Ligand SMILES: Nc1ncnc2c1ncn2[C@@H]1O[C@H](COP(=O)(O)OP(=O)(O)NP(=O)(O)O)[C@@H](O)[C@H]1O
């Protein structure tokens with residue numbers, strides 16, 4: 107008669123935001139099953155593009171058109187970069203690092219590599235230097251509703267001329283308005299782009315003391331966004347896992363049919 | 364008078380395939396330096412796209428237009444997948460795995476995830492099932508002229524109808540001809556796509572015994588290509604490192620100016 111918690115969980119997996127009690131579990135499940143196969147079949151026939159990939163390409167076109175240089179840096183970076191990022195056994199991050207071998211780890215952020223690119227490009231390109239990168243990042247997490255251990259990050263930044271908070275907020279605003287994501291900006295000067303109680307991004311207006319360790323000596327602005335969180339808001343997924351790289355979902359549809 | 368080996372190495376770093384002795388090192392280096400800044404400045408003004416990223420997008424459009432489903436699976440996979448891929452302490456791969464924690468490792472290939480997608484999608488999509496994925500892979504290597512420890516792989520495959528060697532070679536041929544890469548196909552049936560003595564890809568025509576461990580029971584074809592190797596051939600880089608994710612090069616130009 108009444109659906110068990112476990113049965114409800116299974117139904118929620120097959121449930122899509124677009125869908126609209128009483129009937130038995132087997133009926134409800136068969137209904138949802140035929141629907142997802144249908145959605146999957148539609149993707150396969152018409153678009154065939156992966157949400158995460160499609161988003162990355164959409165973000166790339168956005169910044170490339172706005173004068174930012176597309177960067178693809180190593181995902182596997184030296185542990186030494188962590189220490190130099192000011193990540194000591196005093197911050198939360200220190201306990202979220204996935205170590206590899208004895209000298210490396212999985213980048214928990216894009217900052218270090220972008221820092222290097224800013225210093226190096228400054229010697230070859232005209233002010234201001236504008237770069238961005240979209241790629242995998244890794245952190246050990248306790249949560250699983252707004253956090254993934256393997257997520258995708260977007261970090262763009264400008265160094266030199268025009269690096270003001272107003273300009274930064276202008277970029278943030280044009281970006282999210284372009285993607286159709288509702289947000290509110292709240293807040294070296296630091297800002298947080300929020301959607302409800304979900305943190306979409308953290309932005310900072312430099313210069314900041316840490317800049318010196320990386321050979322940076324000019325003002326700059328920048329923000330980092332989690333692609334899965336943007337996907338979560340846009341497609342209204344209730345759980346961040348439906349947007350993550352995985353073998354359990356495809357464009358938010360359960361592959362366990 | 365004569366350039367030292369070390370000076371030659373430095374010049375080669377700044378050297379591009381398009382360029383055309385006697386003069387002193389400082390002169391030669393200053394000449395090359397102004398040239399690279401120029402190239403970099405041109406990229407920044409006109410295109411702004413990263414080679415590796417641009418290639419991925421070009422590969423994606425290719426297969427998407429040809430009916431293949433774009434997949435983005437986890438880069439950090441379970442070690443159990445390695446064992447199930449038939450990778451024992453009998454093969455070379457067993458010694459090339461980058462372990463993470465006690466139960467995970469960095470995917471040294473895309474096979475396991477794609478295997479799962481084939482089994483699952485088979486229950487929802489019409490035959491044949493066509494999928495592909497482009498993403499980072501990791502292997503410990505002794506070489507550094509044709510091997511990277513962090514490289515990018517493309518693996519496409521079709522399961523069900525039309526899975527013949529002829530069709531496989533046809534896909535391979537249209538693909539490389541599209542990218543403008545010279546090659547020769549040589550060779551469960553297995554093929555190697557070569558460029559000189561450089562292995563561009565390994566393709567296999569199933570079914571193969573390993574299929575059973577993953578719940579696969581239909582014929583299939585597929586090939587895996589290294590994106591950095593394709594870039595190496597296309598842009599004529601002498602060293603694979605100029606195409607790799609890095610902080611030392613950008614679209615093959617040295618960032619150490
Ligand atoms: N574990 C994660 N899973 C998914 N996205 C993440 C994760 N960690 C960070 N992000 C995204 O990356 C953005 C910038 O990173 P960062 O500012 O370090 O996040 P945080 O401050 O760790 N956020 P949070 O853990 O939710 O309090 C965050 O605002 C998120 O959009």
Ligand SMILES: Nc1ncnc2c1ncn2[C@@H]1O[C@H](COP(=O)(O)OP(=O)(O)NP(=O)(O)O)[C@@H](O)[C@H]1O
Nearest residue numbers: 502504509510511514562563564565587588589592
């Ligand atoms: N270490 C690497 N660096 C760059 N590309 C690689 C690397 N390993 C494999 N690839 C690419 O991935 C393709 C398919 O993988 P695989 O067939 O396992 O390579 P392999 O057989 O290990 N090739 P090789 O190591 O040169 O003899 C190879 O043909 C290369 O194009």
Ligand SMILES: CC(C)(C)OC(=O)NCCCC[C@H](N)C(=O)O
Nearest residue numbers: 215217261308309310328329330
């Ligand atoms: C200075 C630092 C590391 C905080 O930020 C950068 O160097 N670059 C981009 C910053 C993006 C905001 C925030 N640092 C993030 O992790 O997303």
Ligand SMILES: CC(C)(C)OC(=O)NCCCC[C@H](N)C(=O)O
Nearest residue numbers: 472474518565566567585586587
């Ligand atoms: C069966 C197996 C694992 C060898 O291949 C696949 O399951 N899928 C794609 C194969 C691509 C060729 C080769 N396996 C490679 O690693 O590129």
Ligand SMILES: [Mg+2]
Nearest residue numbers: 198199202245
């Ligand atoms: Mg956190």
Ligand SMILES: [Mg+2]
Nearest residue numbers: 298305307308
């Ligand atoms: Mg934050």
Ligand SMILES: [Mg+2]
Nearest residue numbers: 455456459502
């Ligand atoms: Mg090998």
Ligand SMILES: [Mg+2]
Nearest residue numbers: 555562564565
């Ligand atoms: Mg091979």
